[PDB]
Amino acid sequence: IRLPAHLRLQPIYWSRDDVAQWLKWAENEFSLSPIDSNTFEMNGKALLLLTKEDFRYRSPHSGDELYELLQHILKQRDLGKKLLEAARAGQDDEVRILMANGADVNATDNDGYTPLHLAASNGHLEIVEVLLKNGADVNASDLTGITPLHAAAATGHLEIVEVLLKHGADVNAYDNDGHTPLHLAAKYGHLEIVEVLLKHGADVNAQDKFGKTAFDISIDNGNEDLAEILQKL
């Protein structure tokens, strides 16, 4: 059950055309008998109201499968909404139980916040560690294109940042405005983090959208110690 990103993955928000895309994917993902596109002429809000009997009456060959498939889509998407919230308040027990029941550890929210983005933003390093055990892509990006290394460097959790760089995080990954983690750390005034970024391979050449390096961002921030140290770089 590999959710196609083409589908908004929120059946309730599917359109009549989106329901046809889901049937088209399901016809090939499961090698089911050909399903007429007009079998379901409704939006996702309507599709969620039909019974399994209704699916059978509409598609005798695959209705069964389509309904059970649609039941798993609304189930895996629910576990992600619980894992994202659990990765926020530090419910490490709840974080490990949720992913043990089939929750996708790379499930992103509306802003594309992976559980790793939220865990690093709230100092939940343990959760980070257990998310990386499930193969969490540390190079993921949010709506703003900021990797978890960006949010970890901006929040000030250098212990997390070192764990991200240890698994190989893209240290030179620039933001949507070109703000590499060295820029978010220079804006937030993180000195050690920047020192950890420099040893792991921080790049000032990838300046911000305004053409400002870590020295310029720190000199524009107001903290001279972060400025002086960044200007020394």
From Swiss-Prot:
Site (described: Breakpoint for translocation to form PAX5-ETV6): R8, L9
Residue ranges of coiled coil: none
Tissues expressed in: Ubiquitous.
Domain of life: Eukaryota
PNT domain residues: 1-77
Location(s), subcellular: Nucleus
Record-annotated site: Breakpoint for translocation to form ETV6-MDS2 in MDS: L7, R8
Function: Transcriptional repressor; binds to the DNA sequence 5'-CCGGAAGT-3'. Plays a role in hematopoiesis and malignant transformation.
Protein family: Belongs to the ETS family.
Noted disease: A chromosomal aberration involving ETV6 is found in a form of chronic myelomonocytic leukemia (CMML). Translocation t(5;12)(q33;p13) with PDGFRB. It is characterized by abnormal clonal myeloid proliferation and by progression to acute myelogenous leukemia (AML). Chromosomal aberrations involving ETV6 are found in acute myeloid leukemia (AML). Translocation t(12;22)(p13;q11) with MN1. Translocation t(4;12)(q12;p13) with CHIC2.
Subunit structure: Can form homodimers or heterodimers with TEL2 or FLI1. Interacts with L3MBTL1 and HDAC9.
Name of the featured protein: Transcription factor ETV6
